[PDB]
Amino acid sequence: MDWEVERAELQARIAFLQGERKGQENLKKDLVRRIKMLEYALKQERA
Amino acid sequence: WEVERAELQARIAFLQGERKGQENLKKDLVRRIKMLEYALKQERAK
Amino acid sequence: DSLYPIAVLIDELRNEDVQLRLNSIKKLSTIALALGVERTRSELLPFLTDTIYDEDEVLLALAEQLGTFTTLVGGPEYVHCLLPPLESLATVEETVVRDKAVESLRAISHEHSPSDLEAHFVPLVKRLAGGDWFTSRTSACGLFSVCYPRVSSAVKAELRQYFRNLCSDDTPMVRRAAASKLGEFAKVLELDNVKSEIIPMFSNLASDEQDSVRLLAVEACVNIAQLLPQEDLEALVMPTLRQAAEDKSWRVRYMVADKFTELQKAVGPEITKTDLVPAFQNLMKDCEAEVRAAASHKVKEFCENLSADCRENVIMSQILPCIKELVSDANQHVKSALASVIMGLSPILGKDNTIEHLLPLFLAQLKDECPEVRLNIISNLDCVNEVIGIRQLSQSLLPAIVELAEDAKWRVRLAIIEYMPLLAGQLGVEFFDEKLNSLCMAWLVDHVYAIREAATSNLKKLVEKFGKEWAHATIIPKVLAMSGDPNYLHRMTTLFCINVLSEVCGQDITTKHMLPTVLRMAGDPVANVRFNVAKSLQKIGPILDNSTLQSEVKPILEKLTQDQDVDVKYFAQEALTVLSL
Amino acid sequence: FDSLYPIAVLIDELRNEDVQLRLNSIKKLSTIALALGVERTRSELLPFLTDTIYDEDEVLLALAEQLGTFTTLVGGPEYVHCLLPPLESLATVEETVVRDKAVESLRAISHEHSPSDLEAHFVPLVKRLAGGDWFTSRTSACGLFSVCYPRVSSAVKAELRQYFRNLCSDDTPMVRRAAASKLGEFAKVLELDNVKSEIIPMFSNLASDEQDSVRLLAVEACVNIAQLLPQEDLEALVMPTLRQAAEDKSWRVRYMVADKFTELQKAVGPEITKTDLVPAFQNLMKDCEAEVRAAASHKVKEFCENLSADCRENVIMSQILPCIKELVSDANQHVKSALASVIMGLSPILGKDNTIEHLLPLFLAQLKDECPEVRLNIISNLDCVNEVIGIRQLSQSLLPAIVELAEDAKWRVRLAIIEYMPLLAGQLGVEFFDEKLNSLCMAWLVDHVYAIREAATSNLKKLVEKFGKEWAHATIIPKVLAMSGDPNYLHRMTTLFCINVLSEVCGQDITTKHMLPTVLRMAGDPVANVRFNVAKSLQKIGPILDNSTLQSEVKPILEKLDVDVKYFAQEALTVLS
């Protein structure tokens, strides 16, 4: 029809965004770890 | 009865907003990483 | 370049997304760790002190962060550099930012050398105590107990008098803070200063012009009583506590009622006997109902901590008639609060005294119109059970259980079925089988349907407690003879009992004694019983085995499927769909 | 803590299911190496990356790129020689872009080896790759020869020369192609005696191979070799190979010489060009394959001005112009357009007189060509001859061609020129029109084919859109107004159609004064279809505001207000008011 074809498009959009969303989230997870890794390294270099 | 057409729209708007926020948060995170890199290089030299 | 740990932070704070600045402050330790220690003290903390303005959550994150900076600024020797910005945050209008700044201040107090305590911390306490706006004074109140113990006698005196000036402030808003920290501050004071200055402030704040400060002082009273030695407690604390017990704010009388057992086991048994008992009686007759609620709410433990020598005497002489009139109280929360604890007085009065005086009160409590009073009376039954024996307990339960079970009303008979299992779980099965099972059977042939449902589901609970074989003994013979009944409703009730008992009694019991009976009812003249037979067979089916199922169940469901009644056909095939095919 | 040891961090980032999170892990390997320092980057990181990594193309490429930059992060150039084992592993993998990124990184960190350790660790790597079992190693080695040769001892220069010679006589065509490509890059670092001794034999051997893929890439390196040899010995060695390459039976090789022809010419100077290279250009323009012919045709102007000036003109006329004379009427629509793009630049090279006598027939022939690219490429480069010949001498010589294919029988041809009329008026200029053109545009308007008339009204619109309301008012508007009112009633309708499309570019004053009185005079005409389009026409004008005269438009419009006429008039008056 005309109203149900748009709903599938909308669902497809939400599906794609969801996949990308997860990656980005657990990418930030690694980034913070890296700052922690650098923090610790700096802490050792002062000693 | 196709009120679902508006809630799906709200979901898409929310997801796009979060995508924007997390991306330009990752920007600040990378900046912090570089800041620590620079501090470490200087502390490593002397 | 632009990777300078301060330039980075400025740019972080310029962003508009509030959560981004929040995540910037939350990880401020990274910025200082980049700066090091010299540049942290020199450059960062001035930037944070003078000029930083944001929404309350960011300020609170900053106050949190500053408490952990002791190491990031040079160890204890330099911890005092953290003091400027926190003081700004202790003067903010928002209560949670202030309270977290005070938190961090108390935290880093102990990381000060006493020299640094006198040099930088105590002057900040005085600054905050003498602020023009009350937020400064409220923040100052919380900072006294942490710096007093490690500072010279002269500064101890200064602190004592600044605190005195806070307790007499013109704003109730900081008199309240003083009354809050009163006990926390008296616990760090020498005994002659708590007799000399704490006690007068306690008496002045406890009789203040605001209900709030009065209740806060009587709160910080339980700590006060535990600091003087017994004789001093009387002269000092007891006039104030007596005055509180007759306060005009019912909130303060509630405060006295709620802290009561702590007050008796802080004040010592002698003067509890002297003063708390009469004040307890006056609290059980209190106009406002919540005071009576708290007073009854703390009866068992109050009497358990009385002087061992006079318990019986005092309990019978003055406490018991107050409970006899609290049983007939007007409020339902008073009645139920009493009912939750009136049980614990049987191990205290011993078998005979409990039988004579507690059983009337217990039965009258069971006669109350509440799903909360009655429930509370039956919930806690084992303490009085092991004090007065199972026989003498059930001696005075059946002439009450039966009176409600066979009552003229409709809600009453249903009301006591809900708590029939737990009454029977504890309190013996051998008791159950004599008289208490005839009521559980007569339940099932009640005119009203709700009682019948209650009893049918009750049966499952009873077989949970008592066992498969007890159910085999007493219930199933009486459930199958119910099937033989001219009224078809009871023939239906047999099916419902069989399927609620089919999930508890295992395969053997259900196959042998209940499948022959269920299959005979399939023949029944009334159509309702027939389609219910199909429904019951559908429910029983799963627990059965295949060989008996396909040999005896499936042919009878097939014979039901052609019934020239649309409902029997529908339900017989729904059964066959779930089971056979 | 133990979970922050950068090695453990990299590991726990590498057990991710997603590849983008391992790619963004290896792309920031700089950070892991910098956190480990330089002692542990060698102690444990490089051993980790050398043997353990087996992943997809995307990751290994970034790993090669990162190893390319790790010189400072590894301890400086005294320790650079430890970046070699993992990049060696990567220089043999199956995926090709990872091999080439690893080779690029190896050549980059070559400069960081001091000659003493260059001989020690970097050259044995090139040896190992040049002798590997599977050929990918050998193509990588071909990449590695040129970079390290010059700064190494003379004995190992000889050894490397031998290993490269071995690679050029390899069994597999893939290795031979690689070496053939890198032949010029290697020749640039050799001493001239060794360029004649070793390079030119391998050059002739590859250019005389069995596969065409290698002959193709050896004639490519020919231009680098010819630049390294003096013009005297150049003839003996390079020209046999080059001449046989120009006559190779594979059109791919002949295409390569045609492509690098303007460069080969500058490489061998102007003497050998005149001798043997010009006839090779001639028979390459007469080549049996079309795609070689087009590549040669592109190189005519670049070749002509790059000739010895004394012999340049004589040779151009005698040797190159007949071949153009036949190439203008080639069969492939690509050769023609390729030569059409560049043949215009031959005009300042020959002079006004020679261009008129010998070049103008060729440009006029390629103007009438049916292909649109040939025509457009000719018109695009008309200023090139406009400055050599003159606007008068040029307009006077193409006007016959414009009128030739203006009165051509095929309606497609006439439409093709109406298409290009305004951009051919962009370079003819405001003047040097009028004459018999304007007459051509009017004869377009009276044409039978409707597409021609529609394109010609839409042509007058763009033709005053480039010269101006003043020019239109001076020369076009009278010829248009003269057509309104004439026997054949269809011409009145076309007059009003062009007036409609014409009012869209001229300000109110010029459109009003001269278009309204004759639109209304011709509107009083008896025929109903002419008045019908009159009403439709005043509708579209309207919009150009007339307000004070708009009303004076509404009153004769009501006067005219046979059923079709009334439909159009009522619709116009409703929409206007």
CSV table of C-alpha atoms in Angstrom, one decimal, chain B:
chain,number,residue,atom,x,y,z
B,1,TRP,CA,-4.7,3.7,14.8
B,2,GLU,CA,-1.3,4.2,13.1
B,3,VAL,CA,-0.1,6.0,16.1
B,4,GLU,CA,2.9,3.6,15.8
B,5,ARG,CA,4.0,5.9,13.0
B,6,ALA,CA,4.6,8.6,15.5
B,7,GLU,CA,6.4,6.5,18.1
B,8,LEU,CA,8.7,5.0,15.5
B,9,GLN,CA,9.5,8.5,14.5
B,10,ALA,CA,10.3,9.4,18.1
B,11,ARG,CA,12.6,6.4,18.3
B,12,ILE,CA,14.4,7.4,15.1
B,13,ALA,CA,14.8,11.0,16.5
B,14,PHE,CA,16.2,9.6,19.8
B,15,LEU,CA,18.6,7.3,18.1
B,16,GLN,CA,19.9,10.1,15.8
B,17,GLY,CA,20.4,12.3,18.8
B,18,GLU,CA,22.3,9.7,20.7
B,19,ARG,CA,24.5,9.0,17.7
B,20,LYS,CA,25.4,12.7,17.5
B,21,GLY,CA,26.1,12.9,21.3
B,22,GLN,CA,28.3,9.8,21.5
B,23,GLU,CA,30.3,10.7,18.4
B,24,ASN,CA,31.2,14.2,19.6
B,25,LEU,CA,31.9,12.6,23.0
B,26,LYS,CA,34.4,10.3,21.3
B,27,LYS,CA,36.0,13.5,20.0
B,28,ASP,CA,36.7,14.6,23.6
B,29,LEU,CA,37.9,11.2,24.6
B,30,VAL,CA,40.5,11.1,21.8
B,31,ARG,CA,41.6,14.6,22.8
B,32,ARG,CA,42.2,13.3,26.4
B,33,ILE,CA,44.2,10.4,24.9
B,34,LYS,CA,46.4,12.8,23.0
B,35,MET,CA,46.8,15.0,26.1
B,36,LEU,CA,48.1,12.0,28.1
B,37,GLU,CA,50.3,11.0,25.2
B,38,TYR,CA,51.9,14.5,25.2
B,39,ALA,CA,52.3,14.5,29.0
B,40,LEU,CA,53.9,11.1,28.9
B,41,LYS,CA,56.4,12.1,26.1
B,42,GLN,CA,57.5,15.1,28.0
B,43,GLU,CA,57.8,13.2,31.3
B,44,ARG,CA,59.7,10.5,29.4
B,45,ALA,CA,62.3,13.0,28.1
B,46,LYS,CA,63.0,14.7,31.5
